[PDB]
């Protein structure tokens with residue numbers, strides 16, 4: 155197997171930690187959801203290629219501009235997360251996270267991932283957002299931002315239901331394999 | 334890690350570690366607080382263990398089996414002895430607090446009601462100055478350690494055979510040289526996330542909510558200080574490139 159490195163980035167509310175936890179365990183924990191993610195080395199076989207995908211999180215590093223880039227060296231694929239119940243997390247993707255990722259990871263494929271896709275049809279979520287003249291991120295709005303920032307592709311998932319989770323990581327493996 | 338502590342922290346949560354009949358006697362809010370306290374200790378046990386792989390398995394193994402130039406092993410594993418001391422002492426204090434709290438006749442049923450004071454002591458005074466000084470030095474030597482590792486693995490045959498040999502067992506899957514280095518750098522930024530969630534379930538005793546609030550502010554100041562003390566060192570750097578930063 156070949157060794158590939160993945161790093162997930164995005165605002166604190168983007169759900170990056172939950173996504174890494176649910177994929178590494180193949181489960182949304184029934185008893186306790188961990189606060190933090192240490193690291194993990196996933197055994198993945200995509201399109202007949204066997205890969206060891208090392209997973210890394212940047213949660214906790216958001217306010218530390220000199221500690222944070224120490225997670226980037228030799229990254230092969232970047233997952234750039236935002237939350238579908240948070241239009242403000244999407245607006246931060248182009249002029250905050252994108253310039254940083256392109257500088258420390260030049261020529262590294264970026265996959266823009268819309269998380270919490272199950273909250274797009276949630277009534278409590280729609281009621282709360284409507285109070286600040288807002289609504290859940292639309293499918294076309296995610297594609298457009300991914301297109302605009304030069305992302306390799308755009309995907310959606312729900313850490314809660316597991317839907318779309320395996321596909322994101324298999325596609326990241328494929329992106330990490332390309333030259 | 335030692336078998337005793339591994340078994341005590343083998344469960345995914347505190348609610349699964351204690352006996353069902355003990356768990357049943359507590360309120361939901363207590364269980365929630367104890368699950369986050371358990372995770373902080375369980376991850377501290379893992380952090381110390383990461384540092385023992387670096388000092389005993391990697392560093393000492395290279396000294397006793399390889400012929401490396403003086404200052405190479407130090408360059409690969411900066412501050413590992415100081416870091417191990419800081420975290421083994423902190424883990425000692427956390428584990429003693431759980432031990433004191435055990436019910437008679439039990440090696441697993443406990444409730445930690447006073448974590449705040451221990452956290453204020455760890456992140457204040459001389460021990461805080463030592464953590465700040467040690468991580469400012471470690472994180473500034475992080476990129477140099479990775480580049481030096483990569484250079485050695487690709488050019489030295491016995492170093493490559495050594496790495497492949499000591500990293501072959503399954504329990505070392507996520508613990509290679511570079512993985513240990515990033516694990517250690519990421520550790521400090523995990524503390525405010527764990528402490529804030531503990532504080533979220535520690536409103537029952539006002540003195541405890543206050544101590545946890547103080548501890549959170551202390552951790553953030555330590556982090557802000559470490560972050561301002563970082564400048565990546567580079568093998569064979571020129572003075573001109575440094576003063577034109």
Ligand SMILES: O=C1CC=C(OC(F)F)C=N1
Pocket residue numbers: 176177178179180181316318319320
């Ligand atoms: O064996 C696995 C582990 C994780 C997967 O992701 C799923 F949790 F979403 C799929 N198969």
